[PDB]
Amino acid sequence: PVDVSVSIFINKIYGVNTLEQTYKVDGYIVAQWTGKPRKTPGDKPLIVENTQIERWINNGLWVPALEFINVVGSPDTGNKRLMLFPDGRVIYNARFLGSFSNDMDFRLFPFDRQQFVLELEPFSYNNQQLRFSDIQVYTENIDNEEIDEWWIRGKASTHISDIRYDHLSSVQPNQNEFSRITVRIDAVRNPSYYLWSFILPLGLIIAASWSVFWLESFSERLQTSFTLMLTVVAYAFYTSNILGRLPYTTYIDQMIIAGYGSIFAAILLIIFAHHRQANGVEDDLLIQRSRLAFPLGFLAIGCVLVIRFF
Amino acid sequence: PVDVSVSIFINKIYGVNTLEQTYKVDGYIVAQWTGKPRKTPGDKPLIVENTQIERWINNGLWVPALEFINVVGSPDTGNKRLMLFPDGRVIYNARFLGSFSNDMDFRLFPFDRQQFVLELEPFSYNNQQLRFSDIQVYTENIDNEEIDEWWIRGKASTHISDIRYDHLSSVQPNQNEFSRITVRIDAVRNPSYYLWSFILPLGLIIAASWSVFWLESFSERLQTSFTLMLTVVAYAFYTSNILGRLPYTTYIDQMIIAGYGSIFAAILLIIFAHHRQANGVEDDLLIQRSRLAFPLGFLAIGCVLVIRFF
Amino acid sequence: PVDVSVSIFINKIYGVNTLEQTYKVDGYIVAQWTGKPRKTPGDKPLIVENTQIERWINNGLWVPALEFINVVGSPDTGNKRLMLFPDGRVIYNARFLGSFSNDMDFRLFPFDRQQFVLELEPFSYNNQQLRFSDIQVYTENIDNEEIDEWWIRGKASTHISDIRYDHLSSVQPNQNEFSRITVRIDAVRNPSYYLWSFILPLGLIIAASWSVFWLESFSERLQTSFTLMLTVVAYAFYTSNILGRLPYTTYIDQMIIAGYGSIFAAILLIIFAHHRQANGVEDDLLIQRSRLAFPLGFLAIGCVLVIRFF
Amino acid sequence: PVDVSVSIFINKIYGVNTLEQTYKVDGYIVAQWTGKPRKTPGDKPLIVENTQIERWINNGLWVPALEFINVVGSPDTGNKRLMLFPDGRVIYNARFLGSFSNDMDFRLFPFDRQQFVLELEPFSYNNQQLRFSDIQVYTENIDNEEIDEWWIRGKASTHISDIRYDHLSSVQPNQNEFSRITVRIDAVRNPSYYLWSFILPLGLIIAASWSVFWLESFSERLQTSFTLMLTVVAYAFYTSNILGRLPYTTYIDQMIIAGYGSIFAAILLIIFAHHRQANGVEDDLLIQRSRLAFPLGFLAIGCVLVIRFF
């Protein structure tokens, strides 16, 4: 095996698409190994630009191709460079722009915490012929920044592991484990936009539907509330435009369902007050005092989940 | 004919688009055959990376190109590798990322069960010159997982068949049958999102329109119901954003049409109660008792289909 | 001139986009001609795969490039093959996936009948140097199937014609006519989706607005109708999401305009009934009997067009 | 300088996107010049197909590359051909499919008149080394046709000019002027779709809001009008889906603002009638006679602009 030392410099992270849980990473990858000594023009290292490395690979140079495991599509490699030293070490530098994908858990949607994962692996050479010594990730450009709505908290975590592939076991008897490099970058979602953009209008709608119980007109108790019901019902697919069609429920959908329950319970409660109007003149005060208990009890509904969920 | 043994390793399945019934498959394909013995450096097998296989094909090596039949666009082949053995066998390993298409039947839309199909076939060599011995599909990464909203149930089914092509009969007299490999992966749709996102709000709207019959105001019987009618009418094209413009009707559209029938029948029933108001003071109770029968009978409508359909 | 015999096998037709009147065709194209006899390894025909045909073209082989005239973008050629025979005939087989475009007439939109047209033509060689003997279209995979919402009725029609190009007349004096091959595949749109998805809800809305004339409350005559007016007005741009911004009107837009006329005429009729209320107590029955004539006469409006249009 | 004679044949014009003011042009470009006499096989001209011209350029042939100035992205050149004559003249024929961009003035949006502009220019050779003798544009396929919603009126105008580039002045002292070819194709927008799709529904809404002044119920004067106000307000961003976010106002937006002014003036007028109800029983007729003047005066508003604008 030959040891390869990697250095990944993340230029920027952009285009975090939560619909299909893919993000876009731009950066540079440096892979340095050692070989037989060679002669170079002068004592300076020889620099081979793009569309000239293939001329050296044709002549017999050994340049492994390191692929990205969790990519979507293909990584768009731009300029690439090969630095050959007189002492006999080779440096393969390249620029990559890849749409990577990682599994995300959007339970706590407004207050989420995810991680962007970069997986690097040789395509053909296993650990018997290629090993990863170490990786230093230089996340200086996005160390503590906000990209679109995600804060990058802390540094990046690096891991070197061995992955056993069983589909190559029929062609390689006992050498089918490949060295894999994992780079994890923690990100925390910014809840401010949803706080002033959906939390406040939904809370205002819910408070307006709370304040409909004080009216002395029955038709205006029912029509305005119903309206508010129908608007909150129309607010159902807000999360499905941002995220995907998730099986679980998020905080925003939980408060939407809570608004459904509260407003429909108010509708059924005033209809049950009309049920209790046997003579049509009877007025309720103990069950219509919900004017005071309705808002508080609903408030409790959300906080309970809030605590249980975080 | 020369026998080719295939091994397809599905890295991940993502991007299941039901509008045009295409999904995206990432993975590795290994095709192993045997030939004349050759000399290699040392006793180890010789590994030929990408943009170096063509140099061997130019010199006279026999590397068939296996295409994907049911692809949309072209498969995006990334890194590719050729392993030549001293005993005289050749292994062609490649990474494919293809947008494949399969026919889907969205009758039971929330509780669907489809299959993802991968079809592999030589482009030029028929079964007289190329045969598929066996395929082992290594679906270990997606064995029992949820990808976006589809559960992968069970293992993958493999089939090797012969497809007779009639367009090559005018150029090949009696050898126009090609060996085809089919990989079927069963998937079951997760009904949870539609259960809490569309089933519950539509049921709440329908129950609210059921509870409008108890009012003692005629204008408020009609205006609120009509509203609920117009919202359920506005809920018509929900399925056409997820799936295509299907000729048949799904469960969601069936309950939407059932809501149309129930709510419009309530509208026509209260209008017919006003028809029976010859003196304008007559009140109905046998036909206005639908307050009790209306909800139940409607409930029956859906269950009947539910049973007949599953 | 040298005669070229073509065989086009349509693998599948998908992605029929009516916004820009383009569809996507996948298939195989076989072009067979004859030349000088040559020597091949053994007596079997020699098969030349992709990225190896150019080596033969460099050495002096004559392989014409047949382009697609009505394509949008460029056809995505995948694998390609060249079969050379010892008797001296050449077969050029290729796989094409092209976004083709044809003019469509969406007058009868729900009950349309279009045709998918494939035009094939040599790029450089005219009929003095290249002629098309015959084309057999093998439409076996889509013979009688439904693709997305189009039924393929009957077989495919083939035509071989000569197209005179005037832009090459300044460089070629009397030889500027190119042989063109046209393949026409008839398709009929399935009206079922629009029948249960837009025909029925619009008919229900129109019937509900018909049934508003029986009310004994004037404000509830006007507000509900107006609403129904405003919803039918909001249903104007349904056709523009499916098709383009057509200059003519389709069946769906014709019934939308008919709903405009009927509902606005009902609005103006009840307002004119209020006009006739000089003392405010006068009630009309001859012009308010429209309760019976209104629905029928409107029904007549559509059928008349229906017959005139089909 | 060497004179180059151009012939541009427009196959079709499609995909006119007014959001970013780009259209798509498919066609053929022929560039003919003369050089030293050469020997060809026989007396017929020699035809060099695609991926074979570069072999002649390597050997020393002079083939200039003519770029398109106003393109978006890069032009997708398909098949290309080089015709070499025994008398010593070279013809470069190519097929281009380019997304071109031109500045458009959407003041009169429904009744617009734009022009599609194709700009062709040598990339490197100035007028001291390359001149354009003449261009004949063969717009026979789209001479008098409708493409999507644009009529092509008249023929195409051709112009040959010299463009002085100042960024090449630091590297070329007195030779930095390049020969440019401009092709202008006049197009007139079809106003029919907007006439039956937005002009008529907006006019119907405005007429319905005109006819609300005849009611003898004050609450029904206000609620229905307000509704109509809110719908016309919701019709604000119709132009921004077709065109971009223009700084000026179009005819459709001008009539939308006119509907705002008319309907809000009716709202403020009936509220001012309630202002004049000091005793609550006073009824106005001179200022409430707007029933007659309101519709006419509004009609005048639009026509005035109509005339001033065209």
Place this chain on the structure above:
Amino acid sequence: PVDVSVSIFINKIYGVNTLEQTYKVDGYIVAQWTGKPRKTPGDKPLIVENTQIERWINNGLWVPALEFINVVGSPDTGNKRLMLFPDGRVIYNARFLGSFSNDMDFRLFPFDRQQFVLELEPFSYNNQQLRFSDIQVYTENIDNEEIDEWWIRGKASTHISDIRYDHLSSVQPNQNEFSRITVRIDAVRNPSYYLWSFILPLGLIIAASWSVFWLESFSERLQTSFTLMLTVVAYAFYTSNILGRLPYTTYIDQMIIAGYGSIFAAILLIIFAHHRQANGVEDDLLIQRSRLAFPLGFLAIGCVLVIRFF
């Protein structure tokens, strides 16, 4: 080090997408350096077109590749040219079309002022082997123009700096600083479209909700206002279609929240007037005089921010 003189000519700037803060730049880049003297055909400089420069790079010519740092994806280089002089200087001219990205601050959204930034840098050669002498930016085509909705004010600013890269420090001991060129083009957003398209309709809605306090009907005080509330609530996500999901609030969102506060305060104020109706006949005038103070005080709310923000 060898000095390289750059000249960037911006052909056009288009496609300013504020959702992901990327724009598209088309233009030409000229890089001129000097080397050893060489012999050319005649005394004229030798011009090497595209797909011929690589033949010179193979033979030993030194052509550095200058990349764009802030690009998204990869720059689409079209035609490229190499001008070699007899005195021994090399000019590399190229055409670039790149999707560049810059950080934007959408606080003052309708009255914004941003800058488009182009960053150019050698891929491999540091300042010890490649230096940038000067750059002249020829922004003559977009000097004082409006592109889509942005005015280009003033000229372009050029800067040459040194960027220290730490990821190359492990492979280069003390030479890891690269010469970088920054081009800044100031742009000012045109507020006219938002002035006539969203400022005026929102102001009209707010004024209509101001004018609801003058009614002598309580149900019509509440229902119309509520409606206006619900429409202004529905106007929440207007900014999120133009820009992204920003954490801060813009002017349009600030006035939307101000409309929320004003209209909901009017709703709570008329409900509190009903609270003060202990006998149900009491009418307020000091707190219901808001008819005069309500509009003015709200007006003040916006202006205060306006001044504090600009």
